[model samples]
Target: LHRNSLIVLADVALFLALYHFLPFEHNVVLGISMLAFIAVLWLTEALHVTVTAILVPVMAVFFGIFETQAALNNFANSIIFLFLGGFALAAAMHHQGLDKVIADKVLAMAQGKMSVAVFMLFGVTALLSMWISNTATAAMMLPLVLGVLSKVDADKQRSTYVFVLLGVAYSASIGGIATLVGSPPNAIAAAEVGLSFTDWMKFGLPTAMMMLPMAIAILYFLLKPTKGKVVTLGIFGLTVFLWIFSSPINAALGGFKSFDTLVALGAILMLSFARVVHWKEIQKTADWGVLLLFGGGLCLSNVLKQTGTSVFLANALSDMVSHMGIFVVILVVATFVVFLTEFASNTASAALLIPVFATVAEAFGMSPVLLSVLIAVAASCAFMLPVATPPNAIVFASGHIKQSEMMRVGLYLNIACIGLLTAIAMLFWQ
Candidate 1:
C-alpha cells in the first residue's frame, strides 16, 4: 500500500508537470521523457528521492528540452558549490555528534521542567539550525529527545516526549528562517530580493528572535504535557546565547572567516576534542548517503537546466505572474511553490522556481533577483507534515511522536512563518 501510494504520487506529479509545460511547449519527446523519469522515481524507495533528482538531466537530454548552456548552467552556480561545502561541513558536525551534545546540554539545562524544557529544545534547535542545515540539525537533536523519552516513566504520566520531539523538529526548521545559511532558501531569497548576503541576515536574525519567543510561548500554552521534573539546566544555554552573539565578538577579534561558522567550529572543537562523544558512534550515525544524494542532484539539475526546457517553463510562469501585481504575484508564486516543495525536492523546486520567478520579475518590471530570494525562503516553509521536509521526517522516524502531534504544532509554525517572512522582506528591503 505504501509503495503504491508513492508510485501514484510520482505519476500524478508527472501528469501535472506535463499539462503545465505542454500547453506552451508542445514537446512530445519531453513529455515521454518525463513519464519515464517519473516511473523510475516511483519504483524504488531505497533512494527514490535521489533517483528522481538524478533523472532530471537524462530527461532533459533525451527530449532535447534545454539548450546546452541553459540546461547545464544551474550546475555551475555558486549556490550549488555552497550546498556542497555546506553539506560537507554538516557531515563534519555529524561526525562529532555536535547536534546531540548541544541538545542534551540545553534540555538538561532547561530546568527539567516541561514548559522550560520545551522552550529550551525549541530555542537550542533553532539556534543551531540558523548556522547548520536544518535537516542536519534535526537529525542530531532527534536522538537526544528520544533519549529523554526513553527515560520517561509513561505510567507516571511522563508522556511529554511526543510534544518535546515535535518541538525539536519544528524549532530547527523555524531557526532556518532566520539566517541565509540556516536553510538553502535563504540563499535563494537573498539572490531573488536584491539584498546582499549580509543584508538578508539583518532581517532574518531579528525575525527569528521575534518568532522563536512567540513560538516558545505558544508551545507552553498550547502543547499539553502530563509530567514535570527538576533537572539542572547548565552553561549550555549560556554557551548558545554566547554563540548567537559571538559574531560581533569575532569581528572584534579580527581573525575568523565568518562569525557564525567560526563560533560553531570553535564550540564544536571545545566539546569534541575534550572527548565529549564517542568517535565510533558518530561515524556510525552519519548520513553519508544523503550527502552524496545532494551532490549528485546538483549535478543533474545543472545538466538538465542546460537544455533550456526549464528556462522555457520559467519564462511561462513569469508571464503568468506578471499579471498578478508584484506583491500578490510573489505571495501567490512563493506560496504555491513552497506548497509544492513539500512533495518535491527543495533543491529541485529551487532550480525549477528560480528561472520562472526570474522571468516573472523581469516581465513585471521588478527585480527578479529579489523574487528569487522570496522563493528560497518560501521553499523552506515545509513545516506542516512529517513527510513535508527531511528534518520533519527525521523527527517522525524516531517514532516518539505521532504525525498528528507534528501536524498540530508544525501547522501553527507554518502559518506564522509566512506572515513573518513577508513582513521581514517588505520591512527590511524597502
Candidate 2:
C-alpha cells in the first residue's frame, strides 16, 4: 500500500513539474503532462488500467483543456462501438464452443508434425486477430495450446510447449496489423489519416503475409508441438466472412462511417439467432474494461488534438527528423514507437503518436497517411516484454515460459519486425 501511494505521488509530482516547466502553451502542457503521468501509472500498473483511462478525459476537463461535452463525446466514438461489436462476436464464438472446435480441426491437420503444428497455431491465431482483438484471440488460443501440452511429455517437450505458446501471442499481434479492426491503433490511425479499408489493406495485408512465414520458422526452430483436435466451421466462419467483405458491402451502401459497426453487430446477432451463442453467455464473457480503456484513449487523443499538444510535439520531433533521409526517418519513428509501446498500452501509444506523426510528416514534406500507418503497425509489434502487449501478458500468465525466455527470443523478434517494417515502409508505404 505504501509503495502504491509513493508511485501515485511520483506521478502527481511529475505532472505538476511538466505542466509548469514545459515551454508549450498551458493547455498543451496539460495534455502532455497528463499523458506522461498516465504512462507512468500504466508502466508500473500502480492502478488498474481502467482507472488511468478514466483520468484522461476527467483531467482534461478539470484543467480546462476541453469542454465537458467535448471531453466526454469521445466515449461514444465509432471505434469504441466497433470494439464492442467485436467483443460480443468473440464472446458468442467462445460461448458456443465454436472457437475451440475450429482450433481442434486446424490442429488435427498438423498430425503430430512439429513444423506443421507451429504453422497451424500461428496461422489460426493470426487469422483470428485480423478480425477480432489480439487479446481475445490470445485468450481463446491459450487453452487450446494448454490442452495440446497436456498430451506431451513434460520433461521432454517442455521447451517446445513454451515456444508454441509464445508463438500464439506473437502471431496474434502480427496478424492484428493486417486489418483495421485487428488492432485499435489501426482504426485510430486510419481515422486520423482518412485511410480507407482498401488503402490500409494494401499495406497491412502484405506486411502480415510477409511476417507470417518468418514467425512460423522462428517458433518452429525454437520448439515443436504435438497436434490434437478442438471444435468450428460455424459462426466463426460467418464473422470472418463479413469482416472481409465489409469494404464491398460499404461501397454498395454509398459509404457510411457506421458500416463496420453494423457488420460486427450483425454478426453477433446472427450467432445468437443461430443458437451459436446466447446473450447471457456474451454478458458473462466479454471483457468490459477493455472497452473503457479504448474509449478513454480515444478521448485523450481528441483532447491532445484540440489543445494543439499534438502539433507542438510534432514540431519538436520534426526538427530532429525532418532533415534525415526518408529511410532514416522511418527507422527513427518506428524505433521510438516500438520502444514506447513496450511500457504503454498500444492504443494509448497510438493515440499519442499518430496525431504527432500527422504534423511531423507534414513538416518533413512526407505523406501523413504513410507515417500514421507505420506508427500503427510499429505500435502492435512490441514483442520484447510481457508488459508490451495484452497478448504477451496472457501467455506469460500461463506460467509455462520464463520472462527471460520471452525477452531473449522477443529481442530478435523485435529486430526482425523493425527491419521488416522499415523495409516495407520504404518500399511500399508510398
Candidate 3:
C-alpha cells in the first residue's frame, strides 16, 4: 500500500542497469549511479533534502566508491564554517528581535507612502538576504509584510499585498547572488572556482545591482502595485563587514593565512562571546539540513571526479552548447538553470550541475569559473512558481497571489534574468 516503496524499487533498478550496462568502467558507473540517486531524491523530495543528502557518503562507503574517510571529507570544507557563522548570527538576530526592529524602522521611515514603502521593503529584503539565508530572510519578513497589509480589505487589494510579499521574495533571490555567503549555491560554486568574498562581488555585485532594478521594473510591469507600506544592522552587520574586507584585514594582520573560514569562526565566537546569542539559541536556529546538503553535494562532486563521471557527464552535455556563441551558451545555461530551479531547489540544482558545467567549459575552451558563476546565479532566479524557491513558497503561502499571477510575472522575470546573466557572462567572461 506504500507508494514510495515502489519508487525505491525503481530507483534500485535504475542503479543496477547503469552499473552493469553502462559503457564506462563499473567503478565509474558506480559513481554515476550515485549521482542518479542524488538527482532523483533531490528532485522528488522522496525524503527531506538533507536526509537525501546524508545518503551520499553513506552509499558511497557502502558501495566502495571510496573509503569512509574520503567520502566524508567534504563535510569539513571551509565554507561549512561560513554557514555556521551565518546561521548563528541569524539565530542571534531572531533572539534579539533585531530582524523585526530593522523591518519596522524601514516601514516607519516610509511615512505611510505605500509605494515608497514597498520599494524600501524590496531594498531591505535584498540587503538582508546577502548575509542571511534567503529562506530565513523570507520567513522573517513575511509576518511583517502581512502586518503591512492587515488594514486593507484582502479581497479588494489582494494583488497589492501579494506584490509586496513577492517583492520580498524576488529581492531575496536577487540579493543572495552578490556575495559568496549569500546563497548556498554561490558557496557550492565558489568552492569549485576558488573565489573570495570580494572576488565574487567583483562580478556578482554588478549583476545584483543591475538585476534588482530591472526585476522591480518587471514586477511592476506585470502587476502594478498601486499602493504599499513597509535584519539586525549590528553584530551581523559587523560580521558581513569583516567578510568584505577579509582580504585586506588578513593582509594587514601580517597577511595571515586564514580568510573566509577564519572570519566565519570569528563571527560565531563574537556572537556567543558577546552574549548576543546563547549556544542553545544557535543550536535551535541553525539549519543542520542545509549544512549536510552542502557537505554531501561537495562529496558527490569529488566522487564524480574520482570515478571519472564528471568527465562522462561533461562530454555528454557539452554538445548542447559547445558550438554556440558565448552569449548563446550563457542564454542556454541561464534559461536551463532558471527553469530547472523553478521546480527544484536552487542549491540542489547547482550541486548537480556545477561539476558537469565546469568540465564542459574546460573541454570546450570556455571559462569554467564564469560558466559556474552563471549556473550559481541563474539557479537562484526561480520565480515562476510558488514551489520554485523557498522565498517563493513563503510568499505564496499567504494565499493572496494567484498561481497564474506568479506564473505570468515569473515568466517575465525569468526571461529578464536569463538575458541579464548572459550579458554578465559575455562582458567579463569574453
Winner by TM-score: 3
Our tally of clashes for model 1 stands at: 24
Ranked candidates, highest lDDT first: 3, 2, 1
> Which residue runs of candidate 3 sit more than 4 Å off their true CA positions?
227-234, 315-322, 360-367
lDDT of 2 by residue, 1-430 (tens): 5888888998899988997898777777876887688767766567777787787888877877777888778677665666666667767656656666667889888997454666688888998778667887888888877666554546665444467788888888888988867577787776666565556777899999888778656655655544111222455565556656778877888966667666767766776666666687777656567567666766766766777766677677766665785788888777864574456678667766676566556545667887889888888887757876888889988546668777777767777778888898888745
Q: Candidate 3: minimum summed lDDT over ten consecutive residues — where? A: 224-233
The parts of candidate 2 lying over 4 Å away from their true place are: 112-115, 146-159, 194-199, 221-248, 272-275, 337-344, 359-367, 388-390, 397-400
* lDDT by residue (tens digit), candidate 3, 1-430: 1556666667778877687787677766777777786777776566667877788888878877778988888788877767777778777777777767667887789997565887888888988787677888888887777766655545665445457788889898889888887688888787766677777778787898889999988888767655011123466767778878888788888855548777878877887777777899888877777778888877777777777777766677766655775777667778775555444788778877886677656656666798788888888888878786888888887546777878788888888888878877887864
Residue 82 C-alpha lDDT in model 2: 61
Model 2 lDDT at residue 376: 86
1 against 3, candidate with superior TM-score:
3
lDDT of 1 by residue, 250-303 (tens): 668886544444443444344345444344543444343343344334444333
Best by lDDT: 3
**Deviation from native of the Cα of residue 238 in model 3, angstroms:** 3.5
Question: Worst ten-residue run, lDDT, model 1?
Answer: 227-236
Q: Model 1, 159: alpha-carbon shift in Å?
A: 5.9
Candidate 1, 30: how far from true, in Å?
Answer: 6.0
- How far off is residue 353 in model 3, in Å? 1.2
